[PDB]
Design a protein around this ligand. Sequence first.
Ligand code: FON
Ligand code: FON
Lengths: 325, 319
Amino acid sequence: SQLVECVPNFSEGKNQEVIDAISRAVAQTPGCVLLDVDSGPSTNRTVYTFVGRPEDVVEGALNAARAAYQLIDMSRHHGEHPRMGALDVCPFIPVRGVTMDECVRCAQAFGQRLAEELGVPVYLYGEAARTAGRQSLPALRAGEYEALPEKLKQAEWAPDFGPSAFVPSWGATVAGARKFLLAFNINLLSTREQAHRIALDLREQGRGKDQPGRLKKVQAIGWYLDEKNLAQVSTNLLDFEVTGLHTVFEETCREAQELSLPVVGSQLVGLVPLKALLDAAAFYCEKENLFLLQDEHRIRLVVNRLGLDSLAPFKPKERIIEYLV
Amino acid sequence: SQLVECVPNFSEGKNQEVIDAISRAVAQTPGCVLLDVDSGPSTNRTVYTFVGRPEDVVEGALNAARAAYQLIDMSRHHGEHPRMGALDVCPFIPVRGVTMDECVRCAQAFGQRLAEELGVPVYLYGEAARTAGRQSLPALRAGEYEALPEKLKQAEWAPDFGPSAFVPSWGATVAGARKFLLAFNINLLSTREQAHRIALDLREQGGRLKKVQAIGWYLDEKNLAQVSTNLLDFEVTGLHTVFEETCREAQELSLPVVGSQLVGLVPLKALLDAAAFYCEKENLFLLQDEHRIRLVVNRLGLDSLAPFKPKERIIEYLV
Ligand SMILES: Nc1nc(=O)c2c([nH]1)NC[C@@H](CNc1ccc(C(=O)N[C@@H](CCC(=O)O)C(=O)O)cc1)N2C=O
Ligand SMILES: Nc1nc(=O)c2c([nH]1)NC[C@@H](CNc1ccc(C(=O)N[C@@H](CCC(=O)O)C(=O)O)cc1)N2C=O
């Protein structure tokens, strides 16, 4: 039984009617099981996480996109999270009995069909990228929605699928394939400027080719959320096996400490693979010379050390993918 | 108007119908406003926190006791928290426009009416104690429900109010007056014995912490142990100190602390004092009270077992 995870992000995190309509589009698609919907009002973005056979998740992603096309007007969208499209990024991840190559095929099929139906520009990223410059989502997203009109007039920005036209209500969509990614935000009582400084010091790309960051396979930016009245170092762990949750958290804490800024827990966006939490547990057990044999205790430990309950209760059975599937 | 806080503990933490019946008894009493109900299945105990005018809270506590008398059978009760009565302890605390002396009078009034109306033995503790030996609840509760039959036969244990008879379904009740007390539990991934050993080294009665009582137990529903403490005077020994000391003792045994839990309500200053501790330790500067509270909730891990909502847990935010 082949299983692929699809984690599309949409530029709407305030209007519950719109959020729910997109949820129904996914959940009502044959073969698709919606596992999570995580929306934020200040970030003004929602990530949907669902699974199913390769061909089924492609159909689910398209049904979601079609609903979004009617309900989201990018010309009026603003939020803390970077974005350039109503359906900003649509990734396909291999979960079981599926190769990364097939997921790339799913991304290509999805992208082609999305572009054809809506007449919008679509870019391929990650393992589906046609060129090294399009591998990175932040690179493709540079300048955001506001920069599209100018970018679309340049040959180098010719989309992988669709016309090089600026469609006000939609913008541009990025589609691709990749391994599991962890969207992890670290809370700090600081200014957005201080949080961003830390983000730039830690993210692999740093401040530029001549100014690399400290952590490999980590993307990050800093912001402030009116909703929670606090700043966050928002990160993406592209390969937790290379750089895990504990490492990103501990390094952020260190940098914050150097500036006399306090870290106050964290927030996982969407779902997380069990191993990412167990890897972190192993780290703290070694650092603290602990001895635990139960996974529930390992998880309880990590949840407390990273402060994953800070903004809302962290329920393992609802957040760990292996516990949901 | 005058305001007194009453925080009675009842020996029932599993049967929701019984817990709710007692909540209704309090909430339906004129002048009483129920602010919190905290029930635990392992401790098999529920703490009710309510406020109202002096006489009103006495009536509320009595209505709660009458409901409990018909719904709780102590001959079948067992739990992690020490206990000797269906309504185990009933404290009265001054909140607004009331002196400790008046609260002592409320404790005495409640104690006598309870004893004579239900026909049960009642002891006075805290500021209402009739003798120095009864100021301490742990001393009066020594031996628990199981020791009552024998204790009641001794002149030394004659109740302050009521008959000296052993009432199987009820046991005995302790009533008194005191300043705000903080019920604070620290979570440990350890055995019950290890948690209790730490409790013994930390409690003043031994210990290292002045004005702190402590015992160790296990929460089967959460699969973790807790060093359960009572901060009798947070101005002397605060939340930060109790937490940090427990952490230190646990580290000595390679046992990890995983947050904590406050039972009931807490005065704003107790949280702000703790915030100041971490700000000193970490060289921080935080202008906002919201941030100072957020800092302590994270440092102490107060959201470990359930969300800690300041507006629903801080006295000054509820008054
Ligand atoms: N109450 C609340 N407030 C928030 O601000 C908030 C939450 N909830 N929920 C989750 C999230 C809002 N939603 C999202 C959705 C996705 C990403 C995200 O990082 N997506 C990556 C995906 C990369 C990929 O798939 O390759 C991105 O870079 O686009 C950020 C925020 N969030 C707080 O963030
Ligand atoms: N699900 C859950 N599980 C729990 O075990 C838990 C909660 N919730 N809530 C309630 C509480 C269990 N009950 C209690 C009851 C009282 C004290 C307590 O320290 N009371 C003092 C009062 C002193 C006085 O008023 O003078 C006492 O010594 O009687 C501790 C835990 N608790 C927590 O793990």
